[PDB]
Design a protein around this ligand. Sequence first.
Ligand SMILES: CCCCCCCCCCCCCCCC(=O)OC[C@H](COP(=O)(O)OCCN)OC(=O)CCCCCCCCCCCCCCC
Ligand SMILES: CC(C)CCC[C@@H](C)[C@H]1CC[C@H]2[C@@H]3CC=C4C[C@@H](O)CC[C@]4(C)[C@H]3CC[C@]12C
Ligand SMILES: CC(C)CCC[C@@H](C)[C@H]1CC[C@H]2[C@@H]3CC=C4C[C@@H](O)CC[C@]4(C)[C@H]3CC[C@]12C
Ligand SMILES: CC(C)CCC[C@@H](C)[C@H]1CC[C@H]2[C@@H]3CC=C4C[C@@H](O)CC[C@]4(C)[C@H]3CC[C@]12C
Ligand SMILES: CC(C)CCC[C@@H](C)[C@H]1CC[C@H]2[C@@H]3CC=C4C[C@@H](O)CC[C@]4(C)[C@H]3CC[C@]12C
Ligand SMILES: CCCCn1ccc(N2CCC(c3ccccc3)CC2)c(Cl)c1=O
Ligand SMILES: Cc1ccnc(Nc2nc(-c3cn[nH]c3)c(C)s2)n1
Lengths: 46, 173, 62, 259, 124
Amino acid sequence: SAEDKAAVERSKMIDRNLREDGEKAAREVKLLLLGAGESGKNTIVK
Amino acid sequence: TGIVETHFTFKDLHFKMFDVGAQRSERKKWIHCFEGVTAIIFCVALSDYDLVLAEDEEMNRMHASMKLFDSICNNKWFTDTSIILFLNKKDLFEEKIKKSPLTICYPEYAGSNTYEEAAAYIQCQFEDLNKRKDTKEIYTHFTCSTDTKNVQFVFDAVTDVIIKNNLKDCGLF
Amino acid sequence: VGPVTIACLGALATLFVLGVFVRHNATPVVKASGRELCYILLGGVFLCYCMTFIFIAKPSTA
Amino acid sequence: LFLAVVGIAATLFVVITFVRYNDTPIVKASGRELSYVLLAGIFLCYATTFLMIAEPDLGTCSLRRIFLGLGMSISYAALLTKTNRIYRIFEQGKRSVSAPRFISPASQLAITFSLISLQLLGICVWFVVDPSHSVVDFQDQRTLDPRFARGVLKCDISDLSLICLLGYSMLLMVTCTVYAIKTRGVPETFNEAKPIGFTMYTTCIVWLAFIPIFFGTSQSADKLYIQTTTLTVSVSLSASVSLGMLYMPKVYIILFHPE
Amino acid sequence: IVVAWLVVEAPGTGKETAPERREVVTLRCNHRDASMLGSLAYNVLLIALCTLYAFKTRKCPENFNEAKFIGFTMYTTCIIWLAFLPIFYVTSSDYRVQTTTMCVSVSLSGSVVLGCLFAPKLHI
Ligand SMILES: CCCCCCCCCCCCCCCC(=O)OC[C@H](COP(=O)(O)OCCN)OC(=O)CCCCCCCCCCCCCCC
Ligand SMILES: CC(C)CCC[C@@H](C)[C@H]1CC[C@H]2[C@@H]3CC=C4C[C@@H](O)CC[C@]4(C)[C@H]3CC[C@]12C
Ligand SMILES: CC(C)CCC[C@@H](C)[C@H]1CC[C@H]2[C@@H]3CC=C4C[C@@H](O)CC[C@]4(C)[C@H]3CC[C@]12C
Ligand SMILES: CC(C)CCC[C@@H](C)[C@H]1CC[C@H]2[C@@H]3CC=C4C[C@@H](O)CC[C@]4(C)[C@H]3CC[C@]12C
Ligand SMILES: CC(C)CCC[C@@H](C)[C@H]1CC[C@H]2[C@@H]3CC=C4C[C@@H](O)CC[C@]4(C)[C@H]3CC[C@]12C
Ligand SMILES: CCCCn1ccc(N2CCC(c3ccccc3)CC2)c(Cl)c1=O
Ligand SMILES: Cc1ccnc(Nc2nc(-c3cn[nH]c3)c(C)s2)n1
């Protein structure tokens, strides 16, 4: 249970890394551009 | 050929728009793979209510967008997300508003080709397609040919739905 | 009698708000405030009126 | 004393700012008249506590009546006519055109001291008919069978005198609340319509809770520091809730001058 | 706070006979001033927090804006208890009347909270 304890310690560390990236992903708004092409999408992305 | 996620930040809020479209596959197989989005933006070309697809020779350019817009809002996947409407190239539309009769797109429409009047009827024709509108909101905007000040509207539009989404779960609304 | 009479009237008034709120829960104005915390605040008023009788309550150790 | 020291400092601090910055940035919303006499009344109310409980004798007892009488009757004389003005233009402008003649800084001053003039002639009636006399002690009470007995240094003023004098201010209290309650709809002078209506409700809470204080302590407690120090606190709070709601926000806004 | 104070103190009957040998007081436990001041101190601390938090709720779309009613509740209750100090510290001879003050001020405080907040909502 020596290496297993160290394995759990590594799992806890990367668990925080996934957790902290959750707020960063959730702190950004997501918008979907919809509609036929060549209808003004260029003027709203440049 | 894939999608493009662009980053732009304004007023201390980070945004990550997803340019989905280059995809030429079923799309439906990954339409559900674009949920949890706070809002969607729909771009409409005002000077296309007359143009007709050469290949189809029967479907109008604007009428084609009507079928696509109706399908997007009416599906069960996007029932919990708001709709943002953008109108592109109003200068050409204003030039064609009298040059080309509003009838070309709305034959029922018989009002003066006066821009203000025509713009009002076409705007109201966007939102009367969804069966249920109690939980659906549409934020229509006119932008510009250059669209210099459209960033302010989309910043305000997402703020309205961000607060609304939070209150829906908390039960305050 | 004075404190008891007003407390009895207030206790019925508290039940008036509680009974109406649950009956009219579909109305959006009542649900604008925190519904879960509204009953706690409404309950506290009811406990406030009920505790009024405790100040006399045949005084003893218990 | 705690309210008096901060109150006397607050009223002197606001008046300096209210007059030094006389470029009419936001001060022009209220008239230059009816805003200094009301502030001066609050100054008298705060100064009343300093002079009231201070070496009670024949000289101070006479001074107690005039300063307390003029301290509060002046403050609410301007409040009534300020509230009356707000209702007049709102009522007249709703259907008719323009306002009656008395809406003007020159004419509005005359009626402001008209209510004060009633106290000016009135206060001489009690002063002459029943001059204040420094009672040596009310030794019939506060004396005990054992060797210990001190007494109380009571002044000439009694229940009848203070109630009638305070009654005029109370008479001025109901009329302000009635006028302010009627003009609940948005009247003219937007920036000075809500604080006036909210202050009267706030002030009335102080005096309505003062009823059980007066008829709640004439039984057991000493009549030396309960009918003289509690009364001046209500006077100070009555001015404090009026000075705080009306002038303090203006000072805060004018400090971070937005215009 | 109350449980810790209760453990330190002792709940029981401490009835005493008045030296006047007439109208003996009822079964009294302890002083109501210092043995119970702990609850008052804790409540006052959170009242300021509620008032401070209400200073930012004013900028709300009317229905979510209740700072006007909260301010009145935080002021009317304080005025009741601020003016209650002379009442308790004057009528301290007859116990049947001093205890009546307990049951009236508490009822008034409860009515103010319900009247200021629930009544405007119930009106609509
Ligand atoms: C010196 C001794 C005490 C003096 C106290 C002076 C200050 C308070 C005066 C009046 C009190 C209540 C007024 C509420 C209505 C109002 O004024 O509203 C004003 C605001 C705005 O709200 P709005 O709707 O107008 O939005 C307008 C959008 N622009 O509302 C509020 O939430 C104010 C914040 C809450 C403060 C409540 C009272 C502060 C002290 C409480 C402790 C009392 C202790 C007294 C014991 C001595
Ligand atoms: C608007 C509402 C909340 C006002 C409530 C006022 C209440 C608390 C007041 C109004 C009249 C008061 C009563 C008036 C007279 C007496 C007789 C006295 O020997 C004992 C107290 C008693 C019985 C009072 C108790 C308190 C009382 C009932
Ligand atoms: C915070 C505000 C709303 C509280 C208002 C409470 C009012 C209604 C209560 C509190 C104290 C009460 C008074 C207490 C004592 C007396 C003396 C008695 O011989 C007649 C009734 C009278 C004069 C009461 C009238 C009602 C009264 C003024
Ligand atoms: C200010 C707020 C708390 C409202 C007032 C409530 C309390 C303090 C009021 C209501 C009824 C009042 C009592 C009514 C009647 C009497 C009998 C009188 O001979 C002495 C005062 C005394 C004993 C009053 C003391 C104060 C009192 C108990
Ligand atoms: C700074 C002040 C003016 C804020 C408002 C005070 C109000 C809420 C009143 C209501 C009840 C009051 C307390 C009641 C009883 C006591 C015990 C006595 O030893 C005086 C202080 C103390 C602890 C009082 C302090 C002031 C107090 C807390
Ligand atoms: C701001 C809201 C305050 C709520 N409040 C007010 C008073 C209060 N006491 C009742 C009277 C007691 C007391 C005892 C002796 C003299 C003065 C007072 C002290 C404790 C509680 Cl326990 C409370 O909870
Ligand atoms: C009606 C009312 C409301 C608020 N306040 C007062 N006046 C008071 N004055 C004192 C006091 C000052 N020194 N000693 C006692 C109190 C404890 S409450 N009245």
